[PDB]
C-alpha cells in the first residue's frame, strides 16, 4: 500500500542527513584548505625566510 509515495519521504529524510553534509563536508574541506593555505604560507617558506634572514 505504501508503494513509492512513502519511499519519496524516505529519500527526503535521508537526503537531509547525507546529501547536505556531503556538500558541507566539501565546504569543511574548503575551510581547512584555506586554513592550511595560511599555515603553509607561514611555516615552510617562513622558516626558509628566517634562514636567509640570518644568512643576511
Amino acid at each position: 500500500a505504501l508503494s513509492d509515495a512513502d519511499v519519496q519521504k524516505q529519500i527526503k529524510h535521508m537526503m537531509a542527513f547525507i546529501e547536505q553534509e556531503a556538500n558541507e563536508k566539501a565546504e569543511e574541506i574548503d575551510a581547512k584548505a584555506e586554513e592550511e593555505f595560511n599555515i603553509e604560507k607561514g611555516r615552510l617558506v617562513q622558516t626558509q625566510r628566517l634562514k636567509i634572514m640570518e644568512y643576511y
Partner: protein, 57 residues
C-alpha cells in the same frame, strides 16, 4: 523501496563520495597554490635583499 528507493540511496551516497573526493583533490591544488605564492613572495624578498645589499657595499 525495493528497487527505486535503495538505488537512489546508493546514487546519492555515491555523489557524496565523488564530491568529497573532488574536495580532497582541490585541496591538493590549493596546497600547491599556497606553495607557489609562498615561494613567489619569499623570492621577491630575496630580490630586494640582494639589491639593497649591493647598494650597501
Amino acid at each position: 523501496s525495493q528497487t527505486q528507493g535503495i538505488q537512489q540511496l546508493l546514487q546519492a551516497e555515491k555523489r557524496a563520495a565523488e564530491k568529497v573526493a573532488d574536495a580532497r583533490k582541490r585541496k591538493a591544488r590549493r596546497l600547491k597554490q599556497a606553495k607557489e605564492e609562498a615561494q613567489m613572495e619569499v623570492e621577491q624578498y630575496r630580490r630586494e635583499r640582494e639589491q639593497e645589499f649591493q647598494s650597501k657595499q
